[PDB]
C-alpha cells in the first residue's frame, strides 16, 4: 500500500503538539526539557534560562498550523525574554538558535517585537566580532558587559552568521550586520591553501589557522552552507563563487571511498594527506549542500553512505570509523542531519525516494526516542532495546520535526519554491501567510 503522506504529516504534527504539551507542563520558559525525568535544564547560562526550546519551536509550530501554541510561545517571548544578562553566551549557538529562531517567528507573524529582540541580541553578539582586529568573533561574550573569552575558534563558529545577520540587514536597513558576518568568512577564504582548502581551527586575534585539518564535519560544517545560503538569500556573487570553489576543493581532495562508500575524512589542508578516520553523523548535512551547489549525484552518493548506516544500525551512529564503517560511539544526540539532507535534496526535484528514507528515520525516532514527556537522546544504540539518556536538545524543536513535516505535508503555509532554511532549520524565506 502506498504511503499516505498527508496522514504521516498529521502524525508528525500530533507528536509535535504532544511534545509541546510536555514542554509546557515540565519546562515552561526553560531552555530544554529532560523528558524521561520530566525536568528542565539550562543551555546557554546555567541557572539563567532563555526559553531556548520555546524559541526554537516557534516557526515549526506556525508551519504546522499549531496557532494557539505558536501564539502562546510568542506571547511568552514578548513578556519575558531579554538578554541584559551578566553571563557568558556562546556566540555561535546564540546566533543560530535565538537570533535565528526569533527571526523565523518574526517572518511568520510580522510581530515587530520579535525583530526588536533579535536585533538587540545581535548587537550584543557584535561585540565579539569587534573585539578582534580581523572581525573574527571570539567564542563567548558576556551579554551585558561585552567581555569576550576564548579566541581559539573554528570555521563554523566564525562563519555561521551571514544568513541571520543578512536578514537583519534586509529588515532593519542597516548593512552593518551583513558586512560584519561576510568579513569574517572572507578572512578564512583569503587564506585558502593552493589546493583550495581551509584548516578548520582559527585564532580570532592572530587570524591564523591553529591546526592543519580541513574538514566538512564538526568545527567547519555550516561555514560551507552559509556561503551557498548567502547567494540564495542575498544574491551575493562572492558567496556564490566561494561556495562552489570550496565544494570543488573538497570533492577533489576529501572525497574518498572505503568499502565502496563515499566519505569525507579530514585531510591536511595544504597536502591533502588524510589526517583522520572519523566521520560524525553531523556530516550528513553535506549530502544536501552538495545537491544545492549543483553536485547532486555526489550528494546522493554521500546520502547513500548514511542510508547504509541507518539500515545497518537503525539509528545512525554519532560517529563512525570510515575505514570499517562501524560505530565509534554508542550514544546519540537525537540528531537531525539525515532528514536535513533528505529535505534539501527533495526540494530539487521532489523525488519520492527522499520521502521514503525520511519516513524510515521518523519511524525510527518514534521507536527509540519516545519518553514520558517528549523525545530524548540515546545512551546506547547497540543494546536491544536501545537505552535512553534524558534530554531533548533544543535543535529537535526547530529541525527534524519541521523537516519531516515539510517533506510530508505539502503545506500551503510555505512557498516551497522560495523556502530557505538556516543551519538550525529556521525559515528565513518562504512563509505564505494565511
- Known binding-site residues for Ca(2+) equal 225, 423
Of 100-108, 163-171, 253-261, 296-304, which part binds Na ion (CB under 5 A)?
Answer: 100-108
Nearest to Na ion of 217, 399 (CB atom): 399
Alpha helices in 278-336 (DSSP H): 285-292, 296-313
Nearest to Na ion of 104, 132 (CB atom): 104
- Contact call for residue 160 and Ca ion (CB under 5 A): no
Q: Which does 93 bind (CB under 5 to 8 A by kind): Ca ion, Na ion, none?
A: none
Half-sphere exposure of 253 (CA within 13 A, CB side): 26
- The minimum distance between CB 174 and Ca ion, in angstroms, equals 25
- The minimum distance between CB 60 and Na ion, in angstroms, equals 6
- Contact call for residue 101 and Na ion (CB under 5 A): yes
- The minimum distance between CB 248 and Ca ion, in angstroms, equals 18
Q: Which does 188 bind (CB under 5 to 8 A by kind): Na ion, Ca ion, none?
A: none
**148 CB-near residues (< 8 Å, 6+ apart):** 127, 128, 131, 138, 140, 141, 142
Distance of alpha carbon 300 from alpha carbon 294, whole angstroms: 12
- The minimum distance between CB 237 and Na ion, in angstroms, equals 29
- The minimum distance between CB 340 and Ca ion, in angstroms, equals 6
Of 74-82, 100-108, 250-258, 415-423, which part binds Ca ion (CB under 5 A)?
Answer: 415-423
Distance of alpha carbon 434 from alpha carbon 429, whole angstroms: 15
Q: Is the four-CA dihedral 425, 157, 288, 307 of positive or negative sign?
A: negative
**383 CB-near residues (< 8 Å, 6+ apart):** none
What residues form the annotated binding site? 225, 423
Nearest to Na ion of 202, 428 (CB atom): 428
Distance of alpha carbon 348 from alpha carbon 124, whole angstroms: 37
Half-sphere exposure of 160 (CA within 13 A, CB side): 30
Q: Within 10 A of 80 (CB to CB), how many other CB atoms are there?
A: 11
Q: What is the DSSP letter of 61?
A: H
Nearest to Ca ion of 50, 282 (CB atom): 282
**28 CB-near residues (< 8 Å, 6+ apart):** 54, 76
Distance of alpha carbon 243 from alpha carbon 294, whole angstroms: 10
Distance of alpha carbon 176 from alpha carbon 164, whole angstroms: 12
| Residues 389-428 close enough to bind Na ion by CB under 5 A | 398, 426
- The minimum distance between CB 385 and Ca ion, in angstroms, equals 28
- Contact call for residue 225 and Ca ion (CB under 5 A): yes
Distance of alpha carbon 401 from alpha carbon 382, whole angstroms: 24
- Contact call for residue 59 and Na ion (CB under 5 A): yes
Q: Within 10 A of 404 (CB to CB), how many other CB atoms are there?
A: 27
Q: Which does 101 bind (CB under 5 to 8 A by kind): Ca ion, Na ion, none?
A: Na ion
Q: Which does 59 bind (CB under 5 to 8 A by kind): Na ion, Ca ion, none?
A: Na ion
Distance of alpha carbon 387 from alpha carbon 188, whole angstroms: 42
Q: Which does 225 bind (CB under 5 to 8 A by kind): Na ion, Ca ion, none?
A: Ca ion
Nearest to Na ion of 59, 164 (CB atom): 59
Q: Are 419 and 403 in contact (CB under 8 A)?
A: no
Bridge-based pairing of strands 387-388 and 378-380 is: antiparallel
Number of residues that bind Ca ion (CB under 5 A): 2
Nearest to Ca ion of 44, 373 (CB atom): 44
Of 60-68, 111-119, 190-198, 220-228, which part binds Ca ion (CB under 5 A)?
Answer: 220-228
Binds Ca ion by CB under 5 A, chosen from 154, 254, 319, 423: 423
Residue whose C-beta lies closest to Na ion: 398
Q: Are 290 and 247 in contact (CB under 8 A)?
A: yes
- Contact call for residue 336 and Na ion (CB under 5 A): no
Q: Per-residue x/- mask for Ca ion, residues 178 to 217, rule CB under 5 A?
A: ----------------------------------------
Task: State the residues that interact with Na ion by CB under 5 A.
Answer: 56, 59, 101, 398, 426
Task: State the residues that interact with Ca ion by CB under 5 A.
Answer: 225, 423
Amino acid at each position: 500500500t502506498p504511503e499516505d503522506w498527508k496522514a504521516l504529516a498529521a502524525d508528525v504534527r500530533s507528536e509535535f503538539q504532544w511534545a509541546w504539551q510536555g514542554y509546557v507542563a515540565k519546562a515552561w520558559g526553560k531552555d530544554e526539557i529532560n523528558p524521561v525525568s520530566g525536568t528542565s535544564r539550562s543551555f546557554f547560562i546555567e541557572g539563567h534560562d532563555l526559553g531556548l526550546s520555546l524559541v526554537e519551536a516557534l516557526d515549526t509550530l506556525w508551519i504546522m498550523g499549531l496557532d494557539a501554541e505558536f501564539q502562546a510561545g510568542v506571547d511568552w517571548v514578548k513578556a519575558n525574554l531579554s538578554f541584559d544578562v551578566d553571563g557568558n553566551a556562546q556566540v555561535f549557538e546564540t546566533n543560530i538558535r535565538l537570533v535565528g529562531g526569533l527571526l523565523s517567528a518574526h517572518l511568520a507573524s510580522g510581530d515587530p517585537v520579535l525583530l526588536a529582540k533579535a536585533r538587540d541580541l545581535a548587537d550584543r553578539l557584535a561585540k565579539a566580532f569587534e573585539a578582534s582586529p580581523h572581525g573574527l568573533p571570539w567564542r563567548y561574550v558576556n551579554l551585558r558587559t561585552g567581555a569576550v573569552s576564548d579566541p581559539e575558534t573554528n570555521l563554523a563558529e566564525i562563519g555561521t552568521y551571514l544568513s541571520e545577520f543578512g536578514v537583519l540587514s534586509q529588515l532593519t536597513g542597516e548593512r552593518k550586520y551583513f558586512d560584519m558576518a561576510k568579513r569574517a568568512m572572507r578572512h578564512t577564504l583569503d587564506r585558502r591553501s593552493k589546493i583550495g582548502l581551509m584548516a578548520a581551527n582559527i585564532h580570532a586575534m592572530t587570524g591564523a589557522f591553529t591546526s592543519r585539518n580541513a574538514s566538512i564535519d564538526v568545527y567547519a560544517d555550516s561555514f560551507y552552507e552559509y556561503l551557498w545560503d548567502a547567494w540564495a538569500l542575498f544574491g551575493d556573487e562572492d558567496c556564490k563563487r566561494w561556495a562552489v570553489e570550496c565544494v570543488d576543493a573538497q570533492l577533489a581532495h576529501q572525497a574518498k571511498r572505503y568499502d565502496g562508500r563515499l566519505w569525507f575524512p579530514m585531510v591536511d589542508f595544504e597536502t591533502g594527506a588524510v589526517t583522520g578516520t572519523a566521520q560524525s553523523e553531523l556530516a550528513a548535512y553535506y549530502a544536501g549542500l552538495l545537491g544545492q551547489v549543483g553536485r547532486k549525484a555526489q550528494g546522493d552518493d554521500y546520502l547513500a553512505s548514511f542510508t547504509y548506516l541507518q539500515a545497518t544500525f537503525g539509528v545512525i551512529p554519532e560517529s563512525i570509523d570510515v575505514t570499517t564503517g562501524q560505530p565509534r560511539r554508542k550514544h546519540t544526540g537525537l540528531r537531525p542531519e539525515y532528514p536535513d539532507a533528505c529535505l534539501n535534496l527533495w526540494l530539487i526535484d521532489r523525488d519520492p525516494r527522499y520521502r521514503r528514507l525520511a519516513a524510515i528515520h521518523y519511524r525510527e525516532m518514534k521507536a527509540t526516542s519516545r519518553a514520558a514527556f517528549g523525545y530524548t537522546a540515546l545512551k546506547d544504540i547497540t543494546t536491544r532495546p536501545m537505552t535512553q539518556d534524558d534530554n531533548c536538545p533544543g535543535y529537535w524543536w526547530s529541525e527534524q520535526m519541521k523537516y519531516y513535516y515539510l517533506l510530508f505535508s505539502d503545506t500551503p503555509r510555505i512557498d516551497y519554491g522560495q523556502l530557505q532554511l538556516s543551519t538550525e532549520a529556521n525559515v528565513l524565506r518562504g512563509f505564505r501567510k494565511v
